[PDB]
Design an enzyme around this catalytic site. Structure first.
Site, PDB file in Angstrom:
ATOM      1  N   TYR A 250       0.833  -1.168   0.000  1.00 36.31           N
ATOM      2  CA  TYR A 250       0.000   0.000   0.000  1.00 36.31           C
ATOM      3  C   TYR A 250       0.884   1.239   0.000  1.00 36.31           C
ATOM      4  O   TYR A 250       2.010   1.235   0.499  1.00 36.31           O
ATOM      5  CB  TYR A 250      -1.057   0.056   1.128  1.00 36.31           C
ATOM      6  CG  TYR A 250      -2.152  -1.050   0.944  1.00 36.31           C
ATOM      7  CD1 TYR A 250      -1.926  -2.367   1.362  1.00 36.31           C
ATOM      8  CD2 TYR A 250      -3.362  -0.759   0.347  1.00 36.31           C
ATOM      9  CE1 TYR A 250      -2.868  -3.350   1.157  1.00 36.31           C
ATOM     10  CE2 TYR A 250      -4.352  -1.757   0.166  1.00 36.31           C
ATOM     11  CZ  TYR A 250      -4.067  -3.047   0.549  1.00 36.31           C
ATOM     12  OH  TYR A 250      -5.027  -4.024   0.329  1.00 36.31           O
TER      13      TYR A 250
ATOM     14  N   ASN B  32       2.417  10.885   0.229  1.00 30.64           N
ATOM     15  CA  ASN B  32       2.617   9.961   1.355  1.00 30.64           C
ATOM     16  C   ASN B  32       3.347   8.687   1.011  1.00 30.64           C
ATOM     17  O   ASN B  32       3.855   8.010   1.913  1.00 30.64           O
ATOM     18  CB  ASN B  32       1.273   9.645   2.067  1.00 30.64           C
ATOM     19  CG  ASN B  32       0.722  10.864   2.766  1.00 30.64           C
ATOM     20  OD1 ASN B  32       1.490  11.681   3.260  1.00 30.64           O
ATOM     21  ND2 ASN B  32      -0.588  11.040   2.739  1.00 30.64           N
TER      22      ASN B  32
ATOM     23  N   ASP C 107       1.900   9.700  -8.835  1.00 30.34           N
ATOM     24  CA  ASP C 107       0.891  10.727  -9.028  1.00 30.34           C
ATOM     25  C   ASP C 107       1.313  12.058  -8.322  1.00 30.34           C
ATOM     26  O   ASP C 107       1.934  12.055  -7.260  1.00 30.34           O
ATOM     27  CB  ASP C 107      -0.433  10.211  -8.461  1.00 30.34           C
ATOM     28  CG  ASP C 107      -0.370   9.894  -6.951  1.00 30.34           C
ATOM     29  OD1 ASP C 107       0.524   9.098  -6.516  1.00 30.34           O
ATOM     30  OD2 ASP C 107      -1.255  10.416  -6.188  1.00 30.34           O
TER      31      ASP C 107
ATOM     32  N   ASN D 285       1.349   4.155   1.567  1.00 30.05           N
ATOM     33  CA  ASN D 285       1.997   4.826   2.645  1.00 30.05           C
ATOM     34  C   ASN D 285       3.100   4.003   3.299  1.00 30.05           C
ATOM     35  O   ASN D 285       3.827   4.509   4.185  1.00 30.05           O
ATOM     36  CB  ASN D 285       0.937   5.275   3.659  1.00 30.05           C
ATOM     37  CG  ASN D 285      -0.062   6.284   3.075  1.00 30.05           C
ATOM     38  OD1 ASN D 285       0.042   6.748   1.914  1.00 30.05           O
ATOM     39  ND2 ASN D 285      -1.018   6.673   3.910  1.00 30.05           N
TER      40      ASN D 285
END
Ligand code: NA
Ligand code: NA
Lengths: 193, 193
Positions: free
Chosen positions: B68, B116, B95, B70
């Site tokens: 994921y 993040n 992004d 983060n």
């Protein structure tokens, strides 16, 4: 023991998912922890946040997996094993697409029903745990489920969900005391309006 | 070694995130991989999917973390340390809220910019890796950001992002050969037709 000794809430970690529908489970266990003054703390051993305390004279453990939803077994499974908590003593609270906001239901057994958190738990502990199904509504089509579960609800059905949540919290006494059928009757009778 | 030897794409795992704006980095690396016939395979040792093959005369490794967003550094950091790849040989595609759809830029150095994923990487390998910033637009306010990044773009915005990505794909040759200044000029000049 009949008595529910472990309450798990499913969801995703971080402030960017804290208000999303897929976190309904977390809403329930966090509120339950505040209600009884149980502290939730980082528990990296089990890839979660967890706590332990007295709920109506019983020693109960609370767990929020920090694995992300679809890996929730990576917390629940080892946690349940380490504390030797049998499936029948576990309640898992989670969002439910097939029930409208305001609807809330306690179920025992069955499969995962397409819920990707439960999909990661059932293969390793079996199906005979209890589930607190918190309705979140279904959007138009399958294409929209992702934006729905990972989106914040409008104030209206977020009011409805919260009411249903508060009602289930009021019946946790019956669960920790081993009166599941009564808990079921009382939770499942809740009417949003 | 100004030559780029490791190309990392940032995003979230699973079909439910695949088409979301936050997976722009995965779009770039998956398309790059298919263009050169590099196979991406499960690499649980480094908590990701990786491959390795010849891009335009140079042996390049490709990585998609499966942590994921983060927690991206839990993949990028040990992968890069194991293969002894210096930060100056790494390109990370991600992004960028601070640029519009159809805007794409190559950046060397600097901080995470509030991204993040990069926030999880810069502390451990430092700042001096290259970044391919793929513009996704900024919605009205800080509170619309989650639903923007975790949302699927409308088709007019998708086409703009896809054009920019296609343009960056065509300049990969310059990056793997070490011509970073030329790539930066040629990438950063892109405007949708
Ligand atoms: Na279902
Ligand atoms: Na920024």
């Amino acid at each position: 023991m009949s008595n529910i000794s472990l309450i798990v809430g499913l969801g995703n970690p971080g402030s960017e998912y804290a208000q999303t529908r897929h976190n309904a489970g977390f809403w329930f266990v966090e509120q339950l922890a505040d209600k009884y003054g149980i502290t939730l703390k980082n528990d990296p051993k089990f890839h979660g946040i967890s706590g332990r305390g007295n709920i109506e004279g019983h020693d109960v453990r609370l767990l929020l997996p920090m694995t992300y939803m679809n890996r929730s077994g990576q917390s629940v499974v080892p946690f349940s094993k380490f504390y030797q908590i049998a499936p029948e003593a576990i309640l898992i609270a989670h969002d439910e697409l097939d029930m409208n906001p305001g609807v809330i239901r306690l179920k025992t057994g069955g499969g995962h029903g397409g819920h990707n958190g439960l999909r990661d738990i059932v293969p390793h502990i079996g199906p005979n745990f209890h589930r607190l199904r918190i309705g979140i509504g279904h959007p138009g089509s399958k294409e929209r489920v992702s934006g729905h579960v990972l989106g914040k609800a409008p104030s209206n059905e977020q009011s409805l969900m919260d009411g249903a949540i508060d009602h289930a919290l009021s019946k946790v006494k019956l669960l920790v005391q081993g009166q599941v059928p009564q808990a079921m009757n009382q939770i499942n009778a809740y009417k949003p309006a």
